[PDB]
C-alpha cells in the first residue's frame, strides 16, 4: 500500500458529508485493502476515534484489511442461485481451488468469496470476478473461467 | 451510403452472457465484409433467456435475434442479419414477442429501447416531460399529484409515497434531502439494477421531481457494492445530465437547484433498511436507528429526508408526465399502478414483467416464465425476497396485491419471484434463512444476532435426522422470539421463510404428512 497516496485520498475527501465509506472505498480500490496504518490518518482528518474507524471497517463485509489474492472470485449463495444449483457450485469451487470461503489459494491467485445476489437472479448460478460477471455457471464453466484467470 | 443500426444490450445480465464479445464480433464481421453498421449498446428488453438479444432496425421495425453468441455472428450475416433475414435465432419484430407485448411497462417504458446514456434517446421517449410539468407546479401540487396517483413504496413496505413526501414538504428546514435506496439486497430482484443500468435518466428525473416537491437541493443514491455497473452508469448519467442543464444550480434555466451523487454500499444487506442506510451514508456502522424520530422529519444528518426505493422514484416521471388518474386506474384495491415483477430462479423464461397489480403468481409462472428451467414441477416459490414466505401451489391464484398477499402471510415485497422445482430441500431453505440472518444482523437485537445462529444449529440437528419433532418445536419458539423482539424486518421477518417451509413442507423436516 502507498501510505502517501492514502493520506492524499483522505485529505481530498475530508470535508465530504459522511466521508468515511468513500474514503474506505478509494483506499481499497487503489491499494487492495485498508491497512491498519491508514486508520489513525482517517481518524484524525475526520475528527473520529481510531476505534470508531476500525469498527466501521470490520462491520462492512466489502472491506478487507489484508490483501486478497490476485483475483477475488465471488460466488453467489442466495436463493435464486440456490434454486439452479449454487450449493453444488460452491462445493465444487472449494475442491477445485483447495480453499474455503473468505480464503485464498495456496498459489495466491484466487480468493474465494460468497456474495448474496449479484442481481443476476434469472441467469444463475452467478459469479463475479473483479467486475466481470458470469451466468449459468456450472462446474465446467467455473473451471474454465478460473482457467482464464491464471493465464 | 447505407448504415444499418444494430442493438446489442449493455445490461450487466447481457454482459454476463457475452454481449460485449458479440458487439465486437458484429463490428469485426462488418469490417471484414466492408459493411457499415452502427452498434447501439441499448438496455436489456428484460427477456434474459434470449440475452444477448441482438436487434436490427429494419423497415418493419426492430427485429430480434437471441440468444446470440460470438460464434453465431458470421452465420447471422450470411443469413442476412443486416436486412432482418431469418435465422435459427430469429425472434421476429421485438415488440410482438408476447412476453414483452403483454406487459404494462409504465415505469419500464424505455428499457431496452434506448441507449441508456443518450439524452436524445431519453427525450425522444417522454424523457423529462414529467420534470417539465413539475417545474410549472407548486411543491404541494407535486406532492398532491404523487398522492392522487396511489403510488406506494416499491421497496415492499408499500407506504403511500405522497403522504411521505407531504411530511417532508411540511417540515421546516433549510436543508432537505432526497435519498434513493438502491441497496436492492433481495435475491430474486433486479428491477432497481435495470433502472440504474438501462434508464438512469429516469431515476435522475424522478429524484429531481421529488426534490422540487419537498424543497431539497441535494440527493444521494446509495447503491449496493454488488452492483458496480449501476454505479458507473449512474455517475456517467449524472455527469451528462448536469452538463446539459438537467442538474446543477440552474436546471433548464428555471433557477431551481438539485445536486446528485452516488454512494457505494459495502456488503451489508441490512443497509437496505432505511435508517441503517442513513447511518451508512453518515460514515457509521449500518445499525438500525430507533424511531422516536421518523426519518422523513429527522433523517440524513437530522434533516427532513425523502427515502424512496429506485422503482418508487423511477415511477414519478410517468406519474407527472401522464397524470395521477392515468396511473391510478391501473391495479386493484389499494395497490394502484404497476409493478416490475422479476421472474427468477428455476424459471425457463426469466426476466422483467411489469404488470398491473392483480396478476396472479400462476399467470406469471406459466404464461410468462414457461415453467421451470429444469423442466420439473414447481414445488415452492419465495415472493418478496429472502424475508418473503414460500408460497405452495395452492397460493398461486391469490392476486399479487399488497393486501391480499399480507392476509395469508405472503409478501409482495419488491416483486421478486424465485422458483424452486421439486428437488428443493425445504429444511435446508429454513437453515439458510436462519444462516442469512446471522450473517447480516446489524447486531442490535439478541434473537436476530444470536438466536439466528442457534436456529442454524437446531436446523442442522433436523437435517441430520436427529429428534425432528423436538427440534422443530425449538425452531418455532425461536421464530416467535424473533417476531416479538426484532427492531426491524430483518429479524422480524426471518420466521417467514422458516415458518412457511415448516407449515407447507413438514416432510422435509422428518415429520409426518
Ligand atoms: C433488512 C431490510 C432490508 C431492506 N432492503 C431494502 C432494499 O434493498 N431496497 C429498498 O428500496 N428498500 C429496502 N428495505 C425497506 C426500506 O427500509 C424502506 O421501506 C424503503 O426503502 C422505503 O422506500 P419506499 O417507500 O419507496 O419503498 C429494507 C428493510 C429491511 C428491514
Ligand atoms: S432485527 Fe436484526 S437487523 Fe434489525 S435492528 Fe435488530 S439486530 Fe439489527
Ligand atoms: S440470487 Fe444469485 S444473483 Fe440474485
Ligand atoms: K469474506
Strand order across the beta sheet in which B61-65 lies: B36-40, B3-7, B54-58, B61-65, B90-93
How is A91-143 classified by DSSP, letter by letter? Answer: HHHHHHHT--TTEE-TTSSEEEEEES--S-TTS-S-EEETTEEE-S--HHHHH
CB of B316 sitting under 6 A from ligand 1: no
* Contact check, Cβ <8 Å, B188/A61: no
Ligand 2 pocket test, candidate residues B444, B451, B492, most atoms within 8 A of CB: B444
The nearest alpha carbon in chain A to B287 belongs to A59
Strand order across the beta sheet in which B416-421 lies: B351-356, B338-345, B416-421, B378-383, B390-391
Atom index in ligand 1 nearest the CA of residue B275 equals 17
Residue B411 has, within 13 A of its CA and on its CB side, a CA count of: 26
Q: What are the cell numbers at B188? A: 430474486
> Do A61 and A55 touch, CB atoms closer than 8 A?
no
Q: What are the cell numbers at A1? A: 500500500
Q: How far apart are CA B502 and CA B207, in angstroms?
A: 42
CATH 1.10.1740.10, applies to A71-150? no
3-state class (DSSP) for residue A72: strand
Q: Does A101 contact chain B (CB < 8 Å)?
A: no
> Do B223 and B102 touch, CB atoms closer than 8 A?
no
* Contact check, Cβ <8 Å, A60/B266: yes
Q: What residue has cell string 414460500?
A: B390
* Residue ranges of B 391-430 with Cβ closer than 8 A to chain A: 416, 418-421, 424, 428-429
Cis amide bond preceding B45, omega within 30? no
> Do B341 and B353 touch, CB atoms closer than 8 A?
yes
3-state class (DSSP) for residue B265: coil
Shortest CA distance to B208 belongs to which of B266, B152, B252, B144? B252
* Contact check, Cβ <8 Å, A119/B227: yes
Q: Does A147 contact chain B (CB < 8 Å)?
A: no
Shortest CA distance to B357 belongs to which of B322, B315, B323? B315
Separation in Å, CA of B146 to nearest CA in chain A: 28
Q: Centre a 10 Å sphere on the Cβ of residue B129 and count the other Cβ atoms it contains.
A: 16
What φ, ψ does residue A57 adopt, rounded to 5°?
-65, -45
Q: How far apart are CA B452 and CA B478, in angstroms?
A: 8
How is B218-245 classified by DSSP, letter by letter? Answer: EEEEEE-TT-HHHHHHHHHHHHHHHHTT
Q: Centre a 10 Å sphere on the Cβ of residue A40 and count the other Cβ atoms it contains.
A: 12
Q: What are the cell numbers at A30? A: 487503489
Ligand closest to B272 (CA) is 1
Q: How far apart are CA B225 and CA B240, in angstroms?
A: 23
- Taking CA atoms, B19 is separated from A12, A120, A125, B229, in Å, by 37, 14, 18, 14
Please report the sign of the dihedral spanned by the C-alpha atoms of residue A116, residue A120, residue A123, residue A127: negative
Shortest CA distance to B256 belongs to which of B123, B118, B142, B122? B142
Q: Does A31 contact chain B (CB < 8 Å)?
A: no
> Do B35 and B4 touch, CB atoms closer than 8 A?
yes
> Ligand 3 centroid to B397 CA: how many Å?
26
Please report the sign of the dihedral spanned by the C-alpha atoms of residue B9, residue B10, residue B13, residue B18: positive
Q: What residue has cell string 438466536?
A: B451
- Count each helix (H run) and each strand (E run) in chain A, helices first: 7, 5
Largest pairwise CA distance in chain B? 78
Q: Where in chain A is the domain with CATH 3.40.30.10?
A: 71-150
Shortest CA distance to B10 belongs to which of B123, B117, B101? B117
Q: Centre a 10 Å sphere on the Cβ of residue B468 and count the other Cβ atoms it contains.
A: 18
Q: Does B388 contact chain A (CB < 8 Å)?
A: no
The nearest alpha carbon in chain A to B416 belongs to A121
* Contact check, Cβ <8 Å, A121/B418: yes
B507 by Cβ neighbours in 10 Å (0-12 / 13-18 / 19+) ranks as: exposed
3-state class (DSSP) for residue B86: coil
> Do A9 and A26 touch, CB atoms closer than 8 A?
yes
Give the domains, in start order, of chain B with CATH numbers. 119-329 (3.40.50.11540), 331-421 (3.10.20.600), 426-509 (1.20.1440.230)
Return the C-alpha torsion angle B437, B439, B444, B449, nearest 10: 70
- Taking CA atoms, B207 is separated from B55, B326, B426, B508, in Å, by 31, 21, 41, 46
What φ, ψ does residue B341 adopt, rounded to 5°?
-75, 150
Q: Does B9 contact chain A (CB < 8 Å)?
A: no
Q: Is residue B222 left, alpha or beta, with left meaning phi > 0 and alpha meaning psi from -120 to 50?
A: beta
Residues in A closer than 8 angstroms to B344, CB to CB, are: 80, 121-122, 124
> Do B444 and B456 touch, CB atoms closer than 8 A?
no
Q: What are the cell numbers at B12? A: 450487466
* Residue ranges of B 205-244 with Cβ closer than 8 A to chain A: 225-229
Q: Kindly give the interhelix angle for B310-322 and B191-198, rounded to the nearest 10 degrees.
A: 60
Ligand closest to B286 (CA) is 2
Q: Is B445 marked as a binding-site residue? A: yes
3-state class (DSSP) for residue B25: helix
3-state class (DSSP) for residue B441: coil
Amino acid at each position: 500500500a502507498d501510505a502517501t497516496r492514502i493520506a492524499a485520498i483522505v485529505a481530498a475527501r475530508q470535508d465530504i458529508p459522511g466521508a468515511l465509506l468513500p474514503i474506505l472505498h478509494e483506499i481499497q480500490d487503489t491499494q487492495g485493502y485498508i491497512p491498519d496504518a491508514a486508520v489513525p490518518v482517517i481518524a484524525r482528518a475526520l475528527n473520529l476515534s481510531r476505534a470508531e474507524v476500525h469498527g466501521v471497517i470490520t462491520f462492512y463485509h466489502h472491506f478487507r484489511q489484508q490483501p486478497a489474492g490476485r483475483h477475488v472470485v465471488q460466488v453467489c449463495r442466495a436463493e435464486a442461485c440456490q434454486s439452479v444449483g449454487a450449493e453444488a457450485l460452491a462445493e465444487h469451487a472449494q475442491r477445485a481451488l483447495g480453499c474455503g470461503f473468505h480464503e485464498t489459494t495456496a498459489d495466491g491467485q484466487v480468493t474465494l468469496e460468497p456474495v448474496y445476489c449479484l442481481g443476476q437472479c434469472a441467469c444463475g448460478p452467478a459469479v463475479m470476478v473483479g467486475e466481470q460477471l458470469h451466468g449459468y455457471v456450472d462446474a465446467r464453466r467455473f473451471d474454465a473461467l478460473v482457467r482464464s484467470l491464471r493465464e | 451510403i447505407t448504415i444499418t443500426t444494430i442493438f446489442v444490450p449493455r445490461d450487466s445480465t447481457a454482459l454476463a452472457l457475452g454481449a460485449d464479445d458479440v458487439a465486437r464480433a458484429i463490428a469485426r464481421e462488418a469490417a471484414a465484409r466492408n459493411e457499415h453498421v452502427r452498434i447501439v449498446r441499448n438496455g436489456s428488453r428484460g427477456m434474459f433467456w434470449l440475452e444477448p438479444l441482438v436487434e436490427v432496425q429494419t423497415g418493419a421495425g426492430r427485429v430480434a435475434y437471441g440468444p446470440v453468441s460470438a460464434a453465431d455472428v458470421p452465420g447471422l450475416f450470411d443469413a442476412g442479419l443486416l436486412q432482418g433475414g431469418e435465422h435459427a435465432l430469429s425472434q421476429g419484430v421485438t415488440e410482438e414477442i408476447p412476453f414483452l407485448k403483454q406487459q404494462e411497462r409504465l415505469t419500464f417504458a424505455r428499457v431496452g429501447i434506448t441507449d441508456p446514456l443518450s439524452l436524445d434517446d431519453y427525450r425522444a421517449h417522454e424523457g423529462f416531460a414529467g420534470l417539465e410539468r413539475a417545474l410549472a407546479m407548486q411543491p404541494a401540487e407535486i406532492v398532491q399529484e404523487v398522492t392522487d396517483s396511489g403510488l406506494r413504496g416499491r421497496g415492499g413496505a408499500a407506504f403511500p409515497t405522497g403522504i411521505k413526501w407531504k411530511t417532508v414538504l411540511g417540515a421546516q428546514s433549510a436543508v432537505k434531502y432526497i435519498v434513493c435506496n438502491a441497496d436492492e439486497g433481495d435475491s430474486g430482484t433486479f428491477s432497481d439494477r435495470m433502472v440504474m443500468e438501462d434508464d438512469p435518466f429516469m431515476l435522475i428525473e424522478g429524484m429531481t421531481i421529488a426534490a422540487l416537491a419537498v424543497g431539497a437541493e441535494q440527493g444521494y443514491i446509495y447503491c449496493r457494492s454488488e452492483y458496480p455497473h449501476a454505479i458507473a452508469v449512474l455517475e456517467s448519467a449524472i455527469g451528462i445530465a448536469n452538463a446539459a442543464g438537467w442538474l446543477g444550480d440552474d436546471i433548464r434555466g428555471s433557477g431551481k437547484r438539485f445536486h446528485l451523487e452516488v454512494r457505494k454500499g459495502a456488503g451489508a444487506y441490512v443497509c437496505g433498511e432505511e435508517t441503517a442506510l442513513l447511518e451508512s451514508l453518515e460514515g457509521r456502522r449500518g445499525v438500525v436507528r430507533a424511531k422516536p424520530p421518523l426519518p422523513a422529519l429527522q433523517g440524513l444528518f437530522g434533516k427532513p429526508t425523502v427515502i424512496n426505493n429506485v422503482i418508487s422514484l423511477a415511477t414519478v416521471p410517468v406519474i407527472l408526465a401522464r397524470g395521477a388518474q392515468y396511473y391510478r386506474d391501473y391495479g386493484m384495491g389499494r395497490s394502484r399502478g404497476t409493478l416490475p415483477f422479476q421472474l427468477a430462479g428455476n424459471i425457463k423464461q426469466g426476466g422483467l414483467v411489469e404488470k398491473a397489480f392483480g396478476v396472479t403468481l400462476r399467470e406469471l409462472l406459466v404464461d410468462y416464465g414457461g415453467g421451470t428451467r429444469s423442466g420439473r414441477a414447481i414445488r415452492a416459490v419465495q415472493v418478496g425476497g429472502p424475508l418473503g414466505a414460500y408460497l405452495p401451489e395452492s397460493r398461486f391464484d391469490v392476486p399479487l396485491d399488497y393486501e391480499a398477499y399480507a392476509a395469508f402471510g405472503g409478501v409482495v415485497g419488491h416483486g421478486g419471484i424465485v422458483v424452486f422445482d421439486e428437488t428443493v430441500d425445504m429444511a435446508k431453505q429454513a437453515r439458510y434463512a436462519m444462516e442469512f440472518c446471522a450473517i447480516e444482523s446489524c447486531g442490535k437485537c439478541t434473537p436476530c444476532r444470536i438466536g439466528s445462529t442457534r436456529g442454524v444449529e437446531v436446523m442442522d440437528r433436523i437435517i441430520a435426522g436427529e429428534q425432528p419433532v423436538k427440534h422443530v418445536a425449538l425452531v418455532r419458539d425461536l421464530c416467535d422470539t424473533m417476531l416479538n423482539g426484532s427492531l426491524c424486518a430483518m429479524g422480524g421477518m426471518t420466521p417467514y421463510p422458516v415458518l412457511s417451509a415448516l407449515n407447507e413442507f413438514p416432510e422435509d423436516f422428518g415429520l409426518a404428512s
